[PDB]
Amino acid sequence: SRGVNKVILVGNLGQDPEVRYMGGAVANLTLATSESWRDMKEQTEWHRVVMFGKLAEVAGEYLRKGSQVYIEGQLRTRKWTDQSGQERYTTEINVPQIGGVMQMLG
Amino acid sequence: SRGVNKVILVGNLGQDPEVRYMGGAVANLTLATSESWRDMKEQTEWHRVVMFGKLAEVAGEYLRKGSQVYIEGQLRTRKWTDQSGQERYTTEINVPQIGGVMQMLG
């Protein structure tokens, strides 16, 4: 490991977490961070978040469509093909099994 | 204002910073974070970083291709339509001119 790749988020799940398996468990969820402007104009940011193992497993048993959470992980930009067939890029927040934290807040 | 959007990075640039103007000065650069894991794989992450104003113009005079730098900012995913006319999204680490940090290391 050479450099630092850390992202801290406190925000609310926009929708329920989606947990899948392959045989490790994966959980995807989207949280929001807001800020306020006055010319009241808000600005919500959506954060593609993905967790693995127990952390994923816990997210399923307890996280909901409004739950608030603290997340520690690293930026990871992954490539994929769209139906039109061109490799596209989506940047998510990886929450590593060893090194990443998540916590429900309430 | 409402939630916590925070990201911390320590890594080295891949290419000389790109500074332009509008409006106040804007500076784009990309830096690398590397990692190692078993079953030894090296996966370099590349991070689109953008600063404005005082930070930007400083980045120009001092930062070059191999420099190490510390970064504090927030994630920002912006939406845009391309030339062929499909929607695309880009996720950057915005270094707000108010509250964002940058430091050269050595």
Author numbering:
A (entry chain A), B (entry chain B): 3 to 24, 27 to 43, 49 to 115
Provide the authors' original text about this structure.
Single-stranded DNA (ssDNA)-binding proteins (SSBs) play a central role in cells by participating in DNA metabolism, including replication, repair, recombination, and replication fork restart. SSBs bind tightly and cooperatively to ssDNA, regardless of sequence, and prevent premature annealing and unwanted nuclease digestion. Most, but not all, bacterial SSBs are active as homotetramers, in which four oligonucleotide/oligosaccharide-binding (OB) folds form a DNA-binding domain. In this study, we determined the crystal structure and examined the size of the ssDNA-binding site of an SSB from Salmonella enterica serovar Typhimurium LT2 (SeSSB), a ubiquitous opportunistic pathogen which is highly resistant to antibiotics.
The SeSSB structure was determined at a resolution of 2.8 Å. Two monomers (subunit A and B) of the SeSSB were found in the asymmetric unit. Given that the oligomerization state of bacterial SSBs in solution is tetrameric, the crystallographically related tetramer A-B-A′-B′ is also shown. In both of the subunits, only the N-terminal ssDNA-binding domain (residues 1–115) was ordered and observed. Even in the N-terminal domain, residues in the loops L12 (residues 25–26) and L23 (residues 44–48) were disordered and unobserved. The core of the OB-fold in the SeSSB is made of a six-stranded β-barrel capped by an α-helix. The GGRQ motif, proposed as a regulatory switch for ssDNA binding, and the PXXP motifs, known to mediate the protein–protein interactions, were disordered and disappeared in our crystal structure. The corresponding residues in the SeSSB are W55, F61, and W89, which may play a similar role to that of EcSSB in ssDNA binding. Hydrogen bonds and salt bridges were formed at the dimer–dimer interface of the SeSSB: S3(A)–Q111(B′), G5(A)–Q111(B′), G5(B)–Q111(A′), Q111(A)–G5(B′), Q111(B)–S3(A′), and Q111(B)–G5(A′). The native molecular mass for SeSSB was approximately four times the mass of the monomer and therefore the SeSSB was a stable tetramer.
